[PDB]
Amino acid sequence: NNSIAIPTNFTISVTTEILPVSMTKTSVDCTMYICGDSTECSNLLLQYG
């Protein structure tokens, strides 16, 4: 009911916090992946919208 605890010294503490901010920005060559660089396959691919 009537007792309190009070610091008498202190401590400076440095902690770290690692955060991800950005990730690798890729791009894809939709045809060259799907259809292979050099193919009338690509000519079929454009059918797919």
Binding site: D29, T31, M32, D37, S38
Partner: protein, 49 residues
């Protein structure tokens, strides 16, 4: 996007593989008795006709 390029290089598996018994029947001096048809089993190849 961007790329195409043609130039055909078709360097091939063989180098100097043996031809065949060809140019040996087409160019033989003495053939067989007719019923003893001189079938062989023409050899390994490059029988590139």
């Amino acid at each position: 996007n961007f790329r195409v390029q043609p130039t055909e290089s078709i360097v091939r598996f063989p180098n100097v593989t043996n031809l065949c018994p060809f140019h040996e029947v087409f160019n033989a001096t003495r053939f067989a008795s007719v019923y003893a048809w001189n079938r062989t089993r023409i050899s390994n190849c490059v029988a590139d006709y």
